RNA sequence: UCCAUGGAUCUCCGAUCGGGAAACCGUAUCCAAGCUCCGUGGCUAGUCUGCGCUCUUUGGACUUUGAAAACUUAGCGAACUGAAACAUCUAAGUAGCUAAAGGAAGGGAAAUCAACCGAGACCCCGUUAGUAGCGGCGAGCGAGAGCGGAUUUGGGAUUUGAAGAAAAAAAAAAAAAAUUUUUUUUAAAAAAUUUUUUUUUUUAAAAAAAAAAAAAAAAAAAAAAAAAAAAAAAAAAUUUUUU
RNA sequence: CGAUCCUUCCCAGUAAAACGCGGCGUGUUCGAAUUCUGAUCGCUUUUACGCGAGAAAGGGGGACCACCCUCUAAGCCUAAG
């Protein structure tokens, strides 16, 4: 069995920040929960990341074309 | 046996008979549970449903029976929530452990379990915790800056932080004189 | 390709309002604005489509409303006779930030007076200045249309008395909606002192102010000051209005005047379109009750040359049996054509009718050619009609169709009537005599246990020529039959036709049928 | 008169219904259960067969 | 004396304010409001005001449900005994203990039966039948469907009007067959009512003006008032009107 | 007061399956099925999301498969006997 999370950051092995993964579930439910490295791949966490992070990624684009 | 009756006595009593119409009598019926919960361990915890059964146990030659009892795959796990941002520590089976995966953490089960399906009271009052919580995030919004704005944030921060430094040397030197 | 609003309000047709689906809208949006979703409410295909996206849009927080928005949902909740929801929207607006404006109360008011509850229109025209909302032109107007439709006429003197207080000029709108209520409300010298005061202002009256002078005096059954008027409408170099001339063959319908309506007919040349649907839908009463023919069939054939469906669709039935009553047979076929190619399903009583009048006049053939038609078209066995088929129009033609030839069909038609409510003894007695007479007896018995399970009551000759064409056909055996049938049933036959049953049994080798039937008249003691 | 035949208000209501199945249809590529269960729709063409 | 109705008084335990060897002990709860009496303090000293308790009234704060035979639904669940011993089996889901609910509870309108014919929720009574089936195929245990009765019931989700170039149809002309086939041109004419008060006109008769309402209870809740004539109270010019 | 809808429900950790018991349920594991702006094909419109056509979901009927018949689970309420 395996759950797919959002990540909310980068993490070495498993990918880049705001990409569906599959995990262990142990995995993330004892690590990566708690920190908040991965949320549940459901629709409102899904739109909460997605939309966070073009907020934040559309900042940082414009800073850094200028 | 009629739990759902002995619970809506308590729930009538405690909010006051006059405040309810029928209609939300009907209503309120369709909401508290009414499941066979007997063993007093699975009213303090997070179950799913499971409960103790009790049978036999047959030898293979003779086929003699004993009384014997299957017992729930009980953890007394801390699962993360949300909404709180803390652990909480609960007595849960495995099964509920898998049923709490599948709907995203413990706040998603208790926001997406029907009221008839908590099984308990304690699970009526985390899940009415729970619905508030999440309705009082609701109603609200954060605001993001500009990295300039984050820029000038950050000097402010360090500007207090070094105000409050030096306030407290100078606590230690007047304290001192 | 397509745009954004046609898919949303296909989303919103086609499944259930669920959050999903919410969150699939969600996402398909990439910008919200203001006109976005006024398209999406003009473009929903129902009511609560546009109530769920409209509340579900401004409490997602996807955006905030303005004006327009509030304005159309509240025209369309009002228009479909939700009163409650329009109110309660509107009441939510001073604390949205969305100023009031005076067009939504008129709305709302006209939304209260098409449900006949004039009463909140009145009360909501008080309480808008108690809100502190301008209360000038329109809302007058649109309070006199909504109450004066109901009736109020002192109450409309009392309101156009603040109407002229309070410094606003009244415009001819005004005037002719008070004006067209106190002609309703049967008040001629209030009207005409309400004219005077109409003429005091000096603005000048139009066609439809003439107008409804004309449709006051047409209801007052007063027809030389309607012409009168109309000779004034003359003189005032105006432009005659199509509705002039209609509520002018309103009136000249009063009692006689078709010919008048004709008259002025050809007078149309001045004026330029002609063929107004309300025209044919009004002039047919008057030369049906009349009873005038020639000049009717000319424009009935016009109405179809232009493309014109009248206003009652029972209209069509009415001149139906009053020209059929006349005699001309042969445009009843044009009239149910001209039913067929129109909008108009043909119903059983459109059919019933004429094939009665056919009956009565010597025309089998073609009853016959429409009722195949009939059958074939199962329009009996359709339940949207209201008009059935009478039992003045299938009375006679079983009773042809059995005497003179072929029961199979008359069988078939009446099968296809007792599905609908029929069970006429007349009818069912005419197949056993046409099956009878037609060498088909078992029929005749079929029909008799139809009798005797539907709980219809049975004749005793009906018994009788069934057991004759038994013996004529050579089967004494059913005759016998028949015999006990009837005895079972209550009836008793006479020695004549017992004694051609046993015969019938003896020299046919059936000597022990022929003692039963010795035994039953032994019971019966019948010689 | 209704009570001659209680059963017009419900074989009215269900008409439209009782064209796409006996049990369910197809609708928007899924199946979709009928409006009335088998049983009451099997009273209801009792009622309207034992009239004729 | 007695009866009917309504009142006054109305010790204690069980028992619930705390303790407890049941019938005893200890108990001014706590806090907002406004009122007569009470006492003390302070002003430029008069219909002067500002601080308090005790007890009275109306609220709201803690918390006190609560008993009860059998029936019901659940949890757990024997053994003697029978099998001519005994271990599967039987006794028996019985005895017992426990929990919760109600005057009944429970069940209930088919993811049900049938067999290509059809039936039509649920429970109770009769029958099928000690049959089918289960079983050291031993001892024993033992249906269902159908049929006859009793009661006879279904409701809801649930429905919907969909407000007014080319193809087709209808008119006029044309030809042919015994009506038919083909081509050519085309704001309004519906929205229905009654009471009361005042001032006028007109031949006591009936209509004119301007003022207040009800033709709402569709939907439910809250409040005032419960039928004729007369007595008293309050307001007004004891008396009238209302109550 | 005013024509009264503004939500207990999102609905699969379910049905089934393996082992263990059992009053067809239950302990431990595990786990589906047709649509989520339906899709596919054809047509005019001549460059639609229209019009038509076909096939698509589950349970049961003494292992199991095919065909046929019948029903629509995974919490609606309900008198009397
Ligand atoms: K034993
Ligand atoms: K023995
Ligand atoms: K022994
Ligand atoms: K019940
Ligand atoms: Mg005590
Ligand atoms: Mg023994
Ligand atoms: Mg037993
Ligand atoms: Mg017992
Ligand atoms: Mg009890
Ligand atoms: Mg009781
Ligand atoms: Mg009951
Ligand atoms: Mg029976
Ligand atoms: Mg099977
Ligand atoms: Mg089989
Ligand atoms: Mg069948």
Redesign the pocket.
């Given at each position: 069995?395996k759950l797919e999370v959002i990540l909310t950051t980068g993490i070495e092995k498993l990918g880049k920040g705001g990409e569906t993964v599959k995990v262990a579930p142990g995995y993330f439910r004892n690590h990566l929960m708690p920190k908040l490295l991965a949320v549940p791949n459901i629709d409102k966490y899904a739109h909460l990341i997605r939309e966070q992070r073009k907020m934040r990624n559309y900042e940082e684009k414009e800073e850094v074309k200028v | 046996?009629?739990?759902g009756?002995?619970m809506m006595?308590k729930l009538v009593k405690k909010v006051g008979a006059e405040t309810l119409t029928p209609e939300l009598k009907?209503?309120l019926?369709?909401?508290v549970?009414?499941?066979?919960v007997?063993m007093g361990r699975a009213k303090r915890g997070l179950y799913?449903?499971?409960?103790?059964?009790?049978?036999?146990?047959?030898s293979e030659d003779?086929?003699?029976?004993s009384?014997r009892?299957?017992?729930?795959?009980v953890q007394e796990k801390r699962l993360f929530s949300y909404i709180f941002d803390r652990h909480i520590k609960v007595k849960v089976?495995?099964?509920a452990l898998?049923?709490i995966?599948?709907?995203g953490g413990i706040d998603e089960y208790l926001?997406?379990t029907?009221?008839?399906?908590m099984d308990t009271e304690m699970g009526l009052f985390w899940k009415t915790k729970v619905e508030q919580r999440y309705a009082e995030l609701g109603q609200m919004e954060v605001a993001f800056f500009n990295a300039e704005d984050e820029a000038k944030f950050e000097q402010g921060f360090k500007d207090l932080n070094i105000a409050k430094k030096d306030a407290r040397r100078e606590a230690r030197k007047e304290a001192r004189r | 390709?397509?745009k954004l609003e046609?898919?949303i309000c296909?989303?919103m047709d086609?499944?259930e309002?669920?959050?999903?689906?919410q969150n699939?809208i969600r996402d398909?949006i990439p910008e919200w604005d203001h006109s976005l979703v006024y398209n999406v409410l003009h473009g929903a295909?129902?009511?609560?489509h546009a109530?769920?996206f409209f509340?579900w849009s401004e409490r997602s927080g996807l955006i905030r409303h303005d004006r327009d928005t509030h304005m159309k949902m509240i025209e369309?909740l009002g228009?479909?006779?939700?009163?409650?929801?329009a109110?309660?929207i509107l009441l939510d607006m001073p604390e949205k930030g969305v100023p009031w404006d005076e067009d939504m109360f008129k709305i709302l008011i006209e939304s209260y007076g098409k449900?006949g509850?004039?009463?909140?229109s009145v009360?909501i025209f008080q309480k808008m200045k108690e809100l502190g909302v301008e209360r000038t032109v329109k809302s007058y107007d649109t309070l006199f249309?909504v109450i004066l439709?109901?009736?109020?006429y002192?109450?409309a003197?009392?309101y156009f008395?603040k109407m002229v207080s309070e410094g606003v000029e009244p415009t001819?709108?005004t005037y002719?909606?008070m004006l067209?209520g106190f002609f309703?409300?049967?008040?001629?010298?209030?009207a005409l002192?309400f004219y005077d005061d109409m003429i005091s202002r000096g603005i000048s009256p139009?066609?439809?102010?003439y107008?409804?002078m004309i449709?006051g005096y047409c209801?007052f059954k007063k027809m030389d000051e309607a012409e009168k008027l109309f000779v004034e409408m003359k003189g005032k170099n105006i432009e005659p209005?199509?509705?002039?001339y209609?509520?002018m063959?309103?009136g000249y319908v009063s009692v006689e005047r078709v010919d008048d309506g004709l008259r002025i007919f050809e007078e149309m040349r001045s004026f330029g379109i002609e063929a107004?649907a309300?025209?044919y839908?009004?002039l047919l009463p008057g030369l049906c009750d009349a009873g005038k023919m020639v000049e009717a069939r000319n424009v009935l054939?016009?109405m179809?040359?232009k493309?014109i469906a009248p206003?009652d669709n029972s209209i069509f039935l009415k001149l139906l049996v009053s020209q059929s009553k006349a005699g001309d047979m042969?445009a009843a076929?044009?009239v149910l054509?001209?039913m067929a190619?129109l909008n108009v399903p043909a119903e059983a009583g459109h059919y019933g009718v004429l094939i009665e009048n056919q009956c009565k006049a010597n025309a089998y053939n073609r009853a016959i050619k429409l009722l195949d038609v009939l059958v074939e078209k199962e329009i009996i066995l359709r339940h949207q009609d209201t008009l059935e088929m009478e039992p003045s129009a299938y009375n006679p033609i079983i009773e042809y169709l059995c005497n003179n030839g072929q029961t199979s069909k008359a069988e078939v038609l009446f099968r296809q009537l007792m599905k609908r409510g029929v069970q006429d003894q007349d009818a069912l007695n005419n197949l056993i005599s046409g099956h009878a007479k037609e060498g088909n007896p078992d029929a005749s018995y079929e029909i008799l246990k139809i009798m005797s399970r539907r709980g219809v009551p049975r004749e005793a000759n009906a018994y009788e020529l069934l057991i004759k064409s038994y013996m004529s056909k050579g089967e004494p055996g059913d005759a016998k039959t028949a015999l006990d049938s009837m005895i079972e049933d209550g009836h008793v036959p006479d020695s004549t036709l017992f004694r051609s049953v046993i015969e019938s049994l003896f020299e046919d080798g059936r000597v022990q049928t022929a003692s039963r039937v010795m035994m039953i008249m032994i019971d019966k003691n019948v010689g | 008169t209704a009570v001659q035949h209680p059963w017009r208000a419900?074989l009215?209501?269900?008409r439209?219904?009782l064209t796409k199945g006996?049990?369910?249809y197809?609708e928007?590529?899924?199946?979709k259960?009928?409006?009335?269960?088998?049983?009451?729709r099997?009273?209801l063409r009792?009622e309207v067969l034992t009239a004729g």
């Amino acid at each position: 069995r395996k759950l797919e999370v959002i990540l909310t950051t980068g993490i070495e092995k498993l990918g880049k920040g705001g990409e569906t993964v599959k995990v262990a579930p142990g995995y993330f439910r004892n690590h990566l929960m708690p920190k908040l490295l991965a949320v549940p791949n459901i629709d409102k966490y899904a739109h909460l990341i997605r939309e966070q992070r073009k907020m934040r990624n559309y900042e940082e684009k414009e800073e850094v074309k200028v | 046996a009629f739990r759902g009756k002995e619970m809506m006595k308590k729930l009538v009593k405690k909010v006051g008979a006059e405040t309810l119409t029928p209609e939300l009598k009907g209503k309120l019926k369709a909401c508290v549970p009414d499941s066979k919960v007997v063993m007093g361990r699975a009213k303090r915890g997070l179950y799913a449903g499971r409960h103790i059964q009790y049978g036999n146990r047959v030898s293979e030659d003779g086929g003699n029976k004993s009384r014997r009892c299957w017992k729930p795959n009980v953890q007394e796990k801390r699962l993360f929530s949300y909404i709180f941002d803390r652990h909480i520590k609960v007595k849960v089976t495995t099964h509920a452990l898998r049923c709490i995966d599948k709907a995203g953490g413990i706040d998603e089960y208790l926001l997406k379990t029907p009221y008839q399906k908590m099984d308990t009271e304690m699970g009526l009052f985390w899940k009415t915790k729970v619905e508030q919580r999440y309705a009082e995030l609701g109603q609200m919004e954060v605001a993001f800056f500009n990295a300039e704005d984050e820029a000038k944030f950050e000097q402010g921060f360090k500007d207090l932080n070094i105000a409050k430094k030096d306030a407290r040397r100078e606590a230690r030197k007047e304290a001192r004189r | 390709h397509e745009k954004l609003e046609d898919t949303i309000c296909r989303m919103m047709d086609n499944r259930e309002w669920t959050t999903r689906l919410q969150n699939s809208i969600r996402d398909l949006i990439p910008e919200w604005d203001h006109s976005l979703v006024y398209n999406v409410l003009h473009g929903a295909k129902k009511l609560d489509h546009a109530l769920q996206f409209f509340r579900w849009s401004e409490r997602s927080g996807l955006i905030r409303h303005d004006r327009d928005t509030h304005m159309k949902m509240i025209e369309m909740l009002g228009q479909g006779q939700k009163l409650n929801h329009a109110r309660c929207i509107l009441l939510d607006m001073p604390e949205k930030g969305v100023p009031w404006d005076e067009d939504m109360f008129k709305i709302l008011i006209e939304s209260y007076g098409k449900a006949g509850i004039v009463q909140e229109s009145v009360k909501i025209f008080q309480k808008m200045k108690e809100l502190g909302v301008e209360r000038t032109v329109k809302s007058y107007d649109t309070l006199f249309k909504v109450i004066l439709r109901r009736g109020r006429y002192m109450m409309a003197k009392r309101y156009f008395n603040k109407m002229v207080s309070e410094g606003v000029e009244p415009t001819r709108h005004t005037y002719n909606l008070m004006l067209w209520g106190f002609f309703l409300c049967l008040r001629l010298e209030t009207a005409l002192r309400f004219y005077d005061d109409m003429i005091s202002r000096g603005i000048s009256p139009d066609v439809v102010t003439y107008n409804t002078m004309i449709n006051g005096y047409c209801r007052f059954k007063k027809m030389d000051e309607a012409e009168k008027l109309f000779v004034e409408m003359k003189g005032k170099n105006i432009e005659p209005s199509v509705v002039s001339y209609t509520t002018m063959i309103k009136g000249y319908v009063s009692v006689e005047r078709v010919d008048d309506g004709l008259r002025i007919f050809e007078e149309m040349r001045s004026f330029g379109i002609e063929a107004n649907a309300t025209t044919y839908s009004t002039l047919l009463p008057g030369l049906c009750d009349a009873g005038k023919m020639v000049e009717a069939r000319n424009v009935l054939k016009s109405m179809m040359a232009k493309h014109i469906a009248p206003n009652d669709n029972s209209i069509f039935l009415k001149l139906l049996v009053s020209q059929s009553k006349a005699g001309d047979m042969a445009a009843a076929t044009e009239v149910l054509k001209a039913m067929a190619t129109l909008n108009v399903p043909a119903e059983a009583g459109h059919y019933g009718v004429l094939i009665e009048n056919q009956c009565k006049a010597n025309a089998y053939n073609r009853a016959i050619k429409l009722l195949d038609v009939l059958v074939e078209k199962e329009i009996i066995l359709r339940h949207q009609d209201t008009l059935e088929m009478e039992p003045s129009a299938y009375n006679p033609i079983i009773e042809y169709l059995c005497n003179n030839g072929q029961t199979s069909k008359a069988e078939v038609l009446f099968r296809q009537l007792m599905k609908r409510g029929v069970q006429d003894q007349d009818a069912l007695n005419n197949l056993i005599s046409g099956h009878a007479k037609e060498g088909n007896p078992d029929a005749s018995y079929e029909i008799l246990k139809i009798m005797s399970r539907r709980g219809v009551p049975r004749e005793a000759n009906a018994y009788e020529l069934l057991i004759k064409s038994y013996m004529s056909k050579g089967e004494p055996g059913d005759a016998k039959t028949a015999l006990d049938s009837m005895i079972e049933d209550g009836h008793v036959p006479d020695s004549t036709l017992f004694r051609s049953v046993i015969e019938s049994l003896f020299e046919d080798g059936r000597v022990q049928t022929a003692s039963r039937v010795m035994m039953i008249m032994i019971d019966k003691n019948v010689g | 008169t209704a009570v001659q035949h209680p059963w017009r208000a419900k074989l009215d209501k269900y008409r439209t219904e009782l064209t796409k199945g006996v049990w369910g249809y197809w609708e928007m590529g899924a199946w979709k259960p009928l409006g009335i269960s088998a049983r009451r729709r099997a009273m209801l063409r009792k009622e309207v067969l034992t009239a004729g």
